[PDB]
Every structure is written in C-alpha cells, then in structure tokens.
C-alpha cells in the first residue's frame, strides 16, 4: 500500500535505558523511512529521516538505521522529554503511510489501587434513572481484571469503563467505571463488588458496598 508495520506498541522503560523500535514495510521503500515524536496537544516533531539522517536540532541519542523493508529507531538514553508516542513514516510512494504508534511508559515499580466503592443518591434520581460509579485512582501496571459483579456473576449489562493518560508528575494510571441502572433494576441484588486482580495481593482484593452495610 505500502503498509508500515510498527512494533512493539508499548515499551515501558525507566530513565537512561537503550531502546529500539522496529518498522517493517510491505514493500521496499529504499531508504525513505522517517521517524517522528508525538507529545499530545503538540504537533508531530520530525526526528530522523531517510532511515538514519538526523533533523534540525535533535540530540545524537536518537539514531536510526535500515534499508529496503527493515528499519530501526534507537534511543540509547531516555529522559523526561522522551516520554511520548513515536511512529515510522514512509514517503517512497503515494499513498503516504505511517506506523500505528509506539507509546513510551515509565516504571514506578508496583503500587496499590485506591479503590473508592460508590453508590448513587436521591440527588441523582431526579429523572427516574440512576448510576453506580467506581473510581480507582493511581495503580501500576494497567493490567486490572475489574468487574461490577452481583453475587459472583458476569452479567455486564450497562458496564461503562474509562482509563487515563499516565500523569507525568506521579507516573501512574487511574480508572473509572459506571454501572448504569434504571428505576426498577435498582432493587434486586442485595450487594455488588468493585474488583481488582493486581499482583500486589494475589488473594483477590475485593472492596464491596452493600445496601444494608
């Protein structure tokens, strides 16, 4: 097309590491592979072009190599300002095409999930319809088998999740669910669970809220 197959989609890293991204092209592109940086809000920032040439004002920690179909993009020592999306691009041929992205994470080695089990209110039920929220601020990694269960079940009707950017200051995630329920759906099961399957405690860290206690 030419399809630019970028790999791997996440690298997790800490400051000072040496890290290579890879791009495979469906066709020989000669040497017309280029590499960009994406910081959200900001527009793309050209780093390397023609596989290995380095653009205007770019430090020699960013390098690259390859010819034909196989290309490589190294960063030999990472930093605060290298904490962003990266992607290959080919301009050998129209249509011009891009890699899918490599997001760079940062390693705040393990952390405990601040689960905050919630109910609705009378102040919510102002239109005859409600919703059972659950926040989970600051955890690591994002691998989290959460479920809004009822008596040890997997009926996921109305489960309405969210996730966030890894906040740059504290370098850990957050989560947000919304188990929506109607007027009469709201009285049936006596309690329900906001789960967590973290390696922080291998006995499953359940933190439920009941209708009675």
């Amino acid at each position: 097309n030419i399809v630019m197959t970028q790999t791997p989609k996440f690298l997790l890293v800490s400051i000072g590491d040496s890290i290579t991204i890879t791009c495979k092209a469906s066709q020989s592109v000669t040497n017309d592979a280029a590499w960009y940086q994406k910081k959200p809000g900001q527009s793309p920032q050209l780093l390397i072009y023609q596989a290995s040439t380095r653009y205007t004002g770019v430090p020699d920690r960013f390098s690259g190599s390859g010819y034909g179909t196989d290309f490589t993009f190294t960063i030999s020592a990472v930093q605060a300002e290298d904490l962003a999306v990266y992607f290959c691009h080919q301009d050998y041929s129209s249509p011009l095409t891009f890699g899918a992205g490599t997001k760079l994470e940062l390693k705040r080695a393990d952390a405990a999930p601040t689960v905050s089990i919630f109910p609705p209110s009378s102040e919510q039920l102002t239109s005859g319809g409600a919703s059972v929220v659950c926040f989970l601020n600051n955890f690591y990694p994002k691998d989290i088998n959460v479920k809004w269960k009822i008596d040890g079940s997997e009926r996921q009707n109305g489960v309405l999740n969210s996730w966030t950017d890894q906040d740059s200051k504290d370098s850990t995630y957050s989560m947000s669910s919304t188990l929506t329920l109607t007027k009469d759906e709201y009285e049936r099961h006596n309690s329900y669970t906001c789960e967590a399957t973290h390696k922080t405690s291998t006995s499953p860290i359940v933190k439920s809220f009941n209708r009675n206690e």
Binding site: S116, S121, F135, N137, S162, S176, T178
Partner: protein
C-alpha cells in the same frame, strides 16, 4: 513559516467537510500541501496532495469523493470531502514536506465529528460515600456528569483551584450522548466540614451549574 486551517467541524451524514489551509512563509508554487487525518485509536491516514504546479494525487479509497484545489496568489489550499459518514470522524490536518526531506510542518488541526444530534446539555449528579469503615484519614469523593453533546467540557473542583489529586476521565459515547466522571481525593476530617463545591463549563451549550456535597445519615 507555518500553516493554518478552518472549521466548521461538526456536521451530519451526507454533508461536505470544507477546510481551508492558509499558508505563510513559503509559496504554494514551491511546495505541495498534503491532507492527513488521525482517526481515534488509529495511525495517521493520508488523504491526498496538491503539488506546486497543481497536479493533485488522491488516495484511491477516498477518490470517489475528494477534491483539493488552490490559489497560489492568495496562499490558500481548499480541501473538500463530498459525502460524510460516522467513521470520517478525526482531526484533519494540512501539512508540508521539505525539499529534500519529509513532512515537517503541520496545520493546527480541525476536530470533526459526524452525527445528527441537537446540542443537549449535561446533568450534574454529585457523589459522596456510603458509610462503612472510615480509617486511613483520606476518602475520595465524586462528581458525575451525564448526557451531553457536543464536546468538550471543563470539570473543575472548587472554582479551578483545588487540583492536587483531581483525576477527570476521558468521556464515552452513550447513543448521541457523552458521559464522563471526575474525582478528588481529600483528607477525612475537613470534608466533613470545609466541603468541596463541584462545577462544570460547556462552551457550545453555556451552563455552569454548581453542586455542594452532603452524605446520608447511617
């Protein structure tokens, strides 16, 4: 040295997207202007280009319904796309290449959304906990915002001041309606007393309703 786009962004099915890229610090007669888009959860996707002499080259998949024109003297390039659909939703850019070297100058963006929904405002239903154990001396409160269109919205805590552990989340669609949630983590004993007032700010709608926190009496 750089390029700048237009709206309008928000339109319904079978309607023309019509951006305009206004250019400065280089001639249209010396460089092409490419048009690219980023669909959410996807890579960038190239749509087409008009080169210096006017030649034009479209991506085959949009060639039935794509057109690029220009006026070199006015420094303007005119993008159009002739019959929209729900998955034409993205940020559409105009961009330009070096001489010499690849794409390295970008337009600011055009946020575009394809749907046929009236501008309905949110409904701020606040949140405070449901009793049980109150150890640890920190408890997180909530402020849930439901049922709005279009985007976006500012979810502030106590008039844009309290923001130390404020995590407002990316929204999610609920049949032409968005719902997002916000949280703030504050110590136990002063909220209770010095409670936090939640508020919201919608641009294309214009509602700014506030809500204070009170629990229930278990």
């Amino acid at each position: 040295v750089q390029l700048k786009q237009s709206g309008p962004g928000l339109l319904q099915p079978s309607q023309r997207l019509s951006i305009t890229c206004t250019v400065s610090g280089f001639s249209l007669g010396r460089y092409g202007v490419h048009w690219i888009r980023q669909s959410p959860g996807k890579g960038l996707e190239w749509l087409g280009v008009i080169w210096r002499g006017g030649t034009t080259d479209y991506n085959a998949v949009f060639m039935s319904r794509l057109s690029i024109n220009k006026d070199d003297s006015k420094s303007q390039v005119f993008f159009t796309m002739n019959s929209l659909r729900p998955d034409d939703t993205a940020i559409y850019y105009c961009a330009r290449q070096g001489s010499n070297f690849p794409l390295a100058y970008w337009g600011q963006g055009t946020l575009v959304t394809v749907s046929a929904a009236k501008t309905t405002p949110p409904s701020v239903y606040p949140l405070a906990p449901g009793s049980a154990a109150q150890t640890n001396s920190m408890v997180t409160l909530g402020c849930l915002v439901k049922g709005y269109f279009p985007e976006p919205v500012t979810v502030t805590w106590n008039s844009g001041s309290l923001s130390s552990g404020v995590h407002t989340f990316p929204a999610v669609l609920q049949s032409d309606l968005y719902t997002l949630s916000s949280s703030v983590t504050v110590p136990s004993s002063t909220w209770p007393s010095q409670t936090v007032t939640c508020n919201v700010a919608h641009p294309a709608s214009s509602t700014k309703v506030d809500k204070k926190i009170v629990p229930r009496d278990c």
